[PDB]
Amino acid sequence: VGYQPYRVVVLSFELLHAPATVCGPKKSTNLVKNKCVNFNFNGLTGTGVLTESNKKFLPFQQFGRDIADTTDAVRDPQTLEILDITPCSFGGVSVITPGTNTSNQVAVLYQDVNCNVFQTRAGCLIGAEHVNNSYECDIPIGAGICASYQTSQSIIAYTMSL
């Protein structure tokens, strides 16, 4: 037993900058769509939603670009479905203040974020009620809609009067 032929194989590893081509990861996790999630489809680390597109990819491609040259279309290697990529963070926040010596409450406006709470054309407006009546407006918001403090009394949002 001490002089027998033994076939020795050495399996070494290399530590250098390159993507892990040889790996043992999970073959398929759960598939989630229509929420802003993070994915790694062999070419990117992008955070965005995955909508069901209606465009068919040629059977030799993996990614998809646009006029602005941005990765907004990827092909899922599970069963060959085409999913779009759209960022979930759009614009910023804004605050509507009636002014000094008039009120204390304020309203929060979101620029390009889709949702007391009124879904305006210019995003989401919260803290201000919506009234179908139209008067002259003083505080601009955008897209033909203003905000004002009227009758107790609270902050209202309405279409401006011409």
92 within 8 A of 138, measured Cβ to Cβ:
no
Q: Which of 3, 13, 34, 38 binds another protein (CB under 8 A)?
A: 38
How many Cβ atoms from other residues are within 10 Å of residue 86's Cβ?
Answer: 11
CB of 116 vs another protein, minimal distance in Å: 18
Q: Does 7 bind ligand NAG (CB under 6 A)?
A: no
Q: Which amino acid is at 4?
A: Q
**Which residue's CB atom is positioned nearest to ligand NAG?**
132
Q: Which amino acid is at 71?
A: T
The closest of 112, 120, 119 to 140, measured between CA atoms, is: 120
Q: Does 77 bind another protein (CB under 8 A)?
A: yes
Phi then psi for residue 160, to 5 deg, are -70, 150
Measured from the CB atom, the residue of 98 and 123 that comes closer to ligand NAG is 123
Instruction: Point out which span in 128-136, 139-147, 151-159 binds another protein (CB under 8 A).
Output: 139-147
The closest of 70, 74, 71 to 83, measured between CA atoms, is: 74
Contact residues toward another protein (CB under 8 A) are: 7, 9, 17, 23, 25-32, 36-42, 45, 47, 55, 57-58, 60-70, 73, 76-79, 88-89, 91-100, 102, 109-111, 113, 138-141
